[PDB]
UniProtKB/Swiss-Prot annotation, chain A:
Annotated region described as Disordered, given as residue ranges: 33-49
Protein name in UniProt: Spike protein S2
Known glycosylation sites: N6
Top-level taxonomy: Viruses, Riboviria, Orthornavirae, Pisuviricota, Pisoniviricetes
Gene: S
Natural source organism: Severe acute respiratory syndrome coronavirus 2 (2019-nCoV)
Residue window of the full protein shown: 796 to 844 of 1273
Cleavage (site feature) positions: R20, S21
Fusion peptide 1 as annotated region, ranges: 21-42
Role played: Precursor of the fusion protein processed in the biosynthesis of the S protein and the formation of virus particle. Mediates fusion of the virion and cellular membranes by functioning as a class I viral fusion protein. Contains two viral fusion peptides that are unmasked after cleavage. The S2/S2' cleavage occurs during virus entry at the cell membrane by host TMPRSS2 or during endocytosis by host CSTL.
C-alpha cells in the first residue's frame, strides 16, 4: 500500500520465475527479439528442427 | 556465454572484477592462490 497509488504490475512478482513485471512482460512480448546468440545455439543449429 | 575451462566457480558474492559475460566476473583471490570465476 503506497498512498492509494496502485503499484501492482509495475513491481516484480514472485509468481513468475523471472522478476519482470506484467507491464515489463508486455514490453518484452511486443518487441519481437531476433533470438540472437545471447544463449548458446550451436546445439540448436546442429539439432536441425 | 560458453564452457569455461580453467579457474573454478564459487558461491561467494564479490564485486565485479574482470567480467566474463552474462553476469559472471572472474578475479584472482586466495579462495592455494589461484583464479576463481564467481557470480
Ligand atoms: C492496485 O493496487 C492496490 C493497492 O492496495 C490494490 O489494492 C489493488 O488490488 C490493485 N489493483 C490491481 C488491478 O492490481
Amino acid at each position: 500500500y503506497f498512498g492509494g497509488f496502485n503499484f501492482s504490475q509495475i513491481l516484480p512478482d514472485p509468481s513468475k520465475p523471472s522478476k519482470r513485471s506484467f507491464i515489463e512482460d508486455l514490453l518484452f512480448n511486443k518487441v519481437t527479439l531476433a533470438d540472437a546468440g545471447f544463449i548458446k545455439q550451436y546445439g540448436d543449429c546442429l539439432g536441425d528442427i | 556465454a560458453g564452457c569455461l575451462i580453467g579457474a573454478e566457480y564459487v558461491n561467494n558474492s564479490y564485486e565485479c572484477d574482470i567480467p566474463i559475460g552474462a553476469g559472471i566476473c572472474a578475479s584472482y583471490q586466495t579462495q592455494s592462490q589461484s583464479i576463481i570465476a564467481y557470480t
